[PDB]
Protein backbone atom coordinates (compact mmCIF):
# COMPACT_ATOMS: atom_id res chain seq x y z
CA UNK A 1 0.00 0.00 0.00
CA UNK A 2 1.27 3.47 -0.94
CA UNK A 3 -0.20 6.90 -0.21
CA UNK A 4 0.81 10.01 -2.17
CA UNK A 5 -0.47 13.46 -1.23
CA UNK A 6 -0.78 16.38 -3.65
CA UNK A 7 -2.27 19.86 -3.69
CA UNK A 8 0.12 21.39 -1.18
CA UNK A 9 1.73 24.76 -1.73
CA UNK A 10 1.75 28.46 -0.95
CA UNK A 11 -1.50 30.38 -0.54
CA UNK A 12 -2.62 33.68 0.98
CA UNK A 13 -4.63 33.89 4.21
CA UNK A 14 -8.32 33.60 3.33
CA UNK A 15 -7.64 31.24 0.45
CA UNK A 16 -8.96 27.76 -0.23
CA UNK A 17 -7.03 24.62 -1.16
CA UNK A 18 -8.04 21.02 -1.78
CA UNK A 19 -5.50 18.37 -0.84
CA UNK A 20 -5.81 14.90 -2.32
CA UNK A 21 -4.29 11.52 -1.59
CA UNK A 22 -4.19 8.64 -4.03
CA UNK A 23 -3.66 5.06 -2.88
CA UNK A 24 -2.02 2.33 -4.95
CA UNK A 25 -1.54 -1.37 -4.26
CA UNK A 26 -4.75 -1.71 -2.24
CA UNK A 27 -8.25 -0.40 -2.95
CA UNK A 28 -8.86 2.71 -0.84
CA UNK A 29 -12.28 1.32 0.13
CA UNK A 30 -10.64 -1.06 2.60
CA UNK A 31 -9.49 1.89 4.71
CA UNK A 32 -10.85 4.46 7.09
CA UNK A 33 -8.62 7.44 6.22
CA UNK A 34 -7.33 10.51 8.04
CA UNK A 35 -5.30 13.69 7.75
CA UNK A 36 -2.66 14.63 10.31
CA UNK A 37 -0.62 17.82 10.33
CA UNK A 38 2.53 19.17 11.94
CA UNK A 39 2.99 22.91 12.11
CA UNK A 40 6.47 24.45 12.41
CA UNK A 41 7.71 23.96 15.97
CA UNK A 42 4.62 22.08 17.12
CA UNK A 43 3.71 18.46 17.72
CA UNK A 44 1.48 16.38 15.47
CA UNK A 45 -2.25 17.03 15.42
CA UNK A 46 -5.23 15.13 14.08
CA UNK A 47 -7.08 17.18 11.48
CA UNK A 48 -9.86 15.02 10.05
CA UNK A 49 -10.89 11.42 9.36
CA UNK A 50 -13.44 9.54 7.29
CA UNK A 51 -14.86 6.01 7.32
CA UNK A 52 -14.42 3.70 4.34
CA UNK A 53 -18.02 4.37 3.27
CA UNK A 54 -17.71 8.10 3.84
CA UNK A 55 -20.72 8.11 6.15
CA UNK A 56 -18.80 8.97 9.32
CA UNK A 57 -16.32 11.79 9.80
CA UNK A 58 -14.09 13.45 12.39
CA UNK A 59 -12.87 17.06 12.62
CA UNK A 60 -10.50 18.73 15.08
CA UNK A 61 -12.20 21.72 16.74
CA UNK A 62 -9.55 23.97 15.19
CA UNK A 63 -10.79 23.27 11.66
CA UNK A 64 -14.46 22.44 12.21
CA UNK A 65 -16.63 24.32 9.72
CA UNK A 66 -13.73 25.35 7.49
CA UNK A 67 -12.40 21.93 6.49
CA UNK A 68 -14.35 19.13 4.81
CA UNK A 69 -13.08 15.61 4.24
CA UNK A 70 -14.47 13.42 1.46
CA UNK A 71 -13.49 10.46 -0.69
CA UNK A 72 -14.03 8.81 -4.06
CA UNK A 73 -13.28 5.12 -3.70
CA UNK A 74 -13.78 4.57 -7.43
CA UNK A 75 -10.73 6.81 -7.91
CA UNK A 76 -9.00 5.45 -4.80
CA UNK A 77 -8.61 9.04 -3.62
CA UNK A 78 -9.41 10.92 -0.40
CA UNK A 79 -9.68 14.72 -0.24
CA UNK A 80 -9.38 17.49 2.32
CA UNK A 81 -11.06 20.72 1.28
CA UNK A 82 -9.53 23.59 3.27
CA UNK A 83 -11.43 26.87 3.20
CA UNK A 84 -10.75 30.31 4.69
CA UNK A 85 -7.17 29.33 5.47
CA UNK A 86 -5.26 31.02 8.29
CA UNK A 87 -1.55 31.45 8.94
CA UNK A 88 -1.85 28.92 11.79
CA UNK A 89 -2.97 26.31 9.26
CA UNK A 90 0.59 26.31 7.92
CA UNK A 91 1.99 22.80 8.34
CA UNK A 92 3.00 19.57 6.66
CA UNK A 93 -0.17 17.55 5.98
CA UNK A 94 -0.06 13.77 6.02
CA UNK A 95 -2.71 11.42 4.70
CA UNK A 96 -2.82 8.17 6.64
CA UNK A 97 -4.92 5.04 6.99
CA UNK A 98 -6.41 4.25 10.40
CA UNK A 99 -5.44 0.86 11.85
CA UNK A 100 -7.88 -2.03 11.61
CA UNK A 101 -8.02 -3.84 14.95
CA UNK A 102 -8.29 -7.60 15.36
CA UNK A 103 -9.32 -9.74 18.36
CA UNK A 104 -6.16 -11.85 18.35
CA UNK A 105 -4.10 -12.59 15.23
CA UNK A 106 -7.09 -13.93 13.30
CA UNK A 107 -7.52 -11.32 10.57
CA UNK A 108 -6.40 -10.74 7.00
CA UNK A 109 -6.63 -6.95 6.81
CA UNK A 110 -4.24 -5.03 4.56
CA UNK A 111 -1.44 -3.21 6.40
CA UNK A 112 -1.76 0.37 7.65
CA UNK A 113 0.21 3.14 5.99
CA UNK A 114 1.40 6.75 6.20
CA UNK A 115 1.81 9.16 3.33
CA UNK A 116 4.99 11.15 2.72
CA UNK A 117 3.26 14.45 3.46
CA UNK A 118 2.72 17.69 1.56
CA UNK A 119 3.55 21.20 2.74
CA UNK A 120 0.88 23.89 3.01
CA UNK A 121 2.10 27.41 3.68
CA UNK A 122 -0.48 30.11 4.38
CA UNK A 123 1.29 33.46 4.19
CA UNK A 124 1.36 36.90 2.56
CA UNK A 125 3.54 40.01 2.66
CA UNK B 1 -1.75 15.90 27.29
CA UNK B 2 -0.40 12.41 26.62
CA UNK B 3 3.05 11.67 28.02
CA UNK B 4 5.19 8.72 26.95
CA UNK B 5 7.84 7.23 29.23
CA UNK B 6 9.91 4.07 29.57
CA UNK B 7 12.10 4.84 26.58
CA UNK B 8 15.75 5.78 26.36
CA UNK B 9 18.87 3.72 25.72
CA UNK B 10 18.65 -0.05 25.32
CA UNK B 11 21.23 -2.59 24.18
CA UNK B 12 20.66 -4.52 20.92
CA UNK B 13 18.37 -7.51 21.41
CA UNK B 14 17.04 -5.96 24.61
CA UNK B 15 13.50 -5.11 25.64
CA UNK B 16 11.70 -1.96 26.74
CA UNK B 17 8.16 -1.29 27.89
CA UNK B 18 6.88 2.13 26.92
CA UNK B 19 4.02 3.62 28.91
CA UNK B 20 1.61 6.42 28.11
CA UNK B 21 -0.38 8.28 30.74
CA UNK B 22 -2.51 11.38 30.31
CA UNK B 23 -3.72 14.48 32.10
CA UNK B 24 -7.00 16.00 30.98
CA UNK B 25 -7.77 12.95 28.86
CA UNK B 26 -9.44 9.67 29.91
CA UNK B 27 -7.49 7.12 27.87
CA UNK B 28 -9.82 4.20 28.65
CA UNK B 29 -12.50 5.82 26.45
CA UNK B 30 -10.28 5.74 23.35
CA UNK B 31 -8.84 3.22 20.93
CA UNK B 32 -5.11 3.97 21.19
CA UNK B 33 -2.02 3.54 19.04
CA UNK B 34 1.73 3.95 18.86
CA UNK B 35 3.50 5.71 15.99
CA UNK B 36 7.24 6.11 15.44
CA UNK B 37 9.68 8.11 13.38
CA UNK B 38 13.21 6.84 12.89
CA UNK B 39 15.97 9.35 12.10
CA UNK B 40 15.69 10.49 8.47
CA UNK B 41 12.57 8.43 7.89
CA UNK B 42 8.89 9.23 7.71
CA UNK B 43 6.34 8.54 10.42
CA UNK B 44 4.80 5.07 10.52
CA UNK B 45 2.23 3.04 12.43
CA UNK B 46 3.63 0.65 15.03
CA UNK B 47 0.70 -0.82 16.91
CA UNK B 48 -2.89 -0.12 18.04
CA UNK B 49 -5.37 -1.37 20.65
CA UNK B 50 -9.12 -1.04 21.16
CA UNK B 51 -10.53 0.90 24.09
CA UNK B 52 -11.53 -2.39 25.75
CA UNK B 53 -8.12 -3.83 24.92
CA UNK B 54 -9.62 -6.87 23.21
CA UNK B 55 -8.49 -5.99 19.69
CA UNK B 56 -5.04 -5.10 18.41
CA UNK B 57 -2.86 -4.27 15.39
CA UNK B 58 0.86 -4.65 14.68
CA UNK B 59 2.91 -3.32 11.77
CA UNK B 60 4.63 -6.11 9.86
CA UNK B 61 8.10 -4.96 10.95
CA UNK B 62 7.30 -5.43 14.66
CA UNK B 63 4.65 -8.17 14.74
CA UNK B 64 5.88 -11.09 16.83
CA UNK B 65 8.38 -8.87 18.66
CA UNK B 66 6.05 -6.27 20.20
CA UNK B 67 3.04 -6.51 22.49
CA UNK B 68 0.59 -3.68 23.08
CA UNK B 69 -1.61 -3.68 26.19
CA UNK B 70 -3.49 -1.34 28.51
CA UNK B 71 -4.70 -0.93 32.09
CA UNK B 72 -7.98 0.98 32.09
CA UNK B 73 -7.94 1.22 35.88
CA UNK B 74 -4.79 3.34 35.74
CA UNK B 75 -5.76 4.81 32.37
CA UNK B 76 -2.41 3.82 30.92
CA UNK B 77 -1.35 2.15 27.66
CA UNK B 78 1.82 0.12 27.13
CA UNK B 79 4.02 -1.13 24.30
CA UNK B 80 6.47 -3.89 25.18
CA UNK B 81 9.22 -4.05 22.56
CA UNK B 82 11.49 -7.10 22.37
CA UNK B 83 14.51 -8.15 20.29
CA UNK B 84 15.24 -4.50 19.59
CA UNK B 85 17.54 -3.58 16.73
CA UNK B 86 19.06 -0.50 15.09
CA UNK B 87 15.97 0.01 12.93
CA UNK B 88 13.84 0.39 16.06
CA UNK B 89 15.74 3.52 17.14
CA UNK B 90 13.18 6.31 16.80
CA UNK B 91 10.87 8.74 18.52
CA UNK B 92 7.77 6.85 19.72
CA UNK B 93 4.42 8.62 20.05
CA UNK B 94 1.28 7.41 21.81
CA UNK B 95 -1.92 8.77 20.29
CA UNK B 96 -5.67 8.40 20.63
CA UNK B 97 -7.45 7.27 17.47
CA UNK B 98 -10.23 9.61 16.29
CA UNK B 99 -13.87 8.81 16.99
CA UNK B 100 -15.84 8.98 13.77
CA UNK B 101 -19.25 10.64 13.87
CA UNK B 102 -22.04 8.99 11.81
CA UNK B 103 -23.48 12.36 10.86
CA UNK B 104 -22.97 15.62 12.73
CA UNK B 105 -23.07 16.80 16.33
CA UNK B 106 -21.76 13.74 18.12
CA UNK B 107 -20.25 14.49 21.52
CA UNK B 108 -16.96 12.62 21.36
CA UNK B 109 -13.97 14.23 23.11
CA UNK B 110 -11.23 15.56 20.82
CA UNK B 111 -8.37 13.29 19.76
CA UNK B 112 -4.84 13.91 21.02
CA UNK B 113 -1.17 13.24 20.23
CA UNK B 114 1.67 12.55 22.62
CA UNK B 115 4.87 14.60 22.59
CA UNK B 116 6.89 11.46 21.90
CA UNK B 117 9.88 9.85 23.58
CA UNK B 118 13.20 8.75 22.11
CA UNK B 119 14.28 5.12 22.03
CA UNK B 120 17.92 4.51 21.18
CA UNK B 121 19.10 0.98 20.48
CA UNK B 122 22.84 1.06 21.16
CA UNK B 123 25.48 -0.92 23.04
Residue numbers in the entry:
A (entry chain A): 4 to 128
B (entry chain B): 5 to 127
What does the paper say about this structure?
To our knowledge, Gr6 is the first sdAb derived from human VH with this characteristics and the solved crystal structure of Gr6 presented here is the first structure of human sdAb with a dimeric conformation. The monomer structure of Gr6 has the same fold as the canonical immunoglobulin variable domain, consisting of two β -sheets with five and four strands. The total buried ASA at the interface of approximately 2200 Å2 is contributed from both monomers of ∼ 1100 Å2. The interactions between monomers are predominantly by hydrophobic contacts involving residues Val37, Leu45, Trp47, Ala50, Tyr58, Tyr91, Val93, Leu95, Pro96, Leu98, Ala101 and Trp103. Polar interaction in the interface includes 9 direct hydrogen bonds. No salt bridges and water molecules are found throughout the interface. Among those residues, Val37, Leu45, Trp47, Ala50, Trp103 are the hall mark residues situated at the VH-VL heterodimer interface of the immunologlobulin variable domain. The other four residues that contribute to the Gr6 dimerization, Leu95, Pro96, Leu98 and Ala101 positioned on CDR3 loop are unique to Gr6. This suggests that these residues play essential roles in Gr6 dimer formation and replacement of these residues in Gr3 (Leu95-Pro, Pro96-Glu, Leu98-Gln, Ala101-Arg) disrupts the inter-domain interaction. In this work, the Gr6 crystal structure shows that the VH-VH interface mimics the classical association of VH-VL dimer, strongly suggesting that Gr6 is a strict dimer and that the structure does represent the dimerization in solution.
